[PDB]
Design a protein around this ligand. Sequence first.
Ligand SMILES: Cc1ccc(C)n1-c1ccc(O)cc1C(=O)O
Ligand SMILES: [Mg+2]
Length: 278
Amino acid sequence: EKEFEQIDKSGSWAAIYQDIRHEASDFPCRVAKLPKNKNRNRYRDVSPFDHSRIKLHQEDNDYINASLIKMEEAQRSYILTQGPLPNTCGHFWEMVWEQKSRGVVMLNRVMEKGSLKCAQYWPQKEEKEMIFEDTNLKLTLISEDIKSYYTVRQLELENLTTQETREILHFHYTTWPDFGVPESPASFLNFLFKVRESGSLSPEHGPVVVHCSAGIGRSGTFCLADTCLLLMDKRKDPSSVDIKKVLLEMRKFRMGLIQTADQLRFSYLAVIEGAKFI
Ligand SMILES: Cc1ccc(C)n1-c1ccc(O)cc1C(=O)O
Ligand SMILES: [Mg+2]
């Protein structure tokens, strides 16, 4: 609150953001850069660090552009990944299956600014299921709840090899503007609360899988707000929760979390407003 007003009045958002970017950790991404993985990486997207990458349980190629963000004190984990490519939808759902995730959080529309941001990786009609032959998975739309700011879908994922099925919840925030950030964090906070209310972020399940469009953040704002709000509830002194410190901690696991000074300001606003509600 006080820190927000001081930065806002002095026009220091870009300076604070540049300092975070300059202090952000840099770890190798050697596996991501291997020639055989060139078509598994979305152009203009970041690469996962070797130390925190999620490995597919496959003998030939274990690579997927996804990272595990593990927040020790908050007891929260998140898998941050790129929006699936036309050839990586099978890998994406293999990761959801292997990591025992209950929720997938999508913070972009399939088309934004007249360009495709990710493959249509889930079925749009109940009777038209998707089959991922490469990873032997079937995915069916069970139900859809379309709201004004976001849509929730219940999906059924089937391992065709064993016929075992799992219910996956798809939380799709459909109203993040093509340019900049939302004017108010209210709908984004309601979306985060809806994800929380589903059990998708809880330790009884594998990490939630979060993604957006290449190189333009968003995913970081979701995880950063969730972890900050949880720490404010857990700590004896909620005012000791430093969002810049939490962000730098998350940045140890995946690069590029919070891609603009506007997203940093938006993250502060979502945490301040969310703490007032909680
Ligand atoms: C109850 C329902 C009908 C259709 C869906 C997709 N649902 C959900 C199922 C689980 C969940 O956590 C949220 C929702 C919802 O729409 O709020
Ligand atoms: Mg129909």
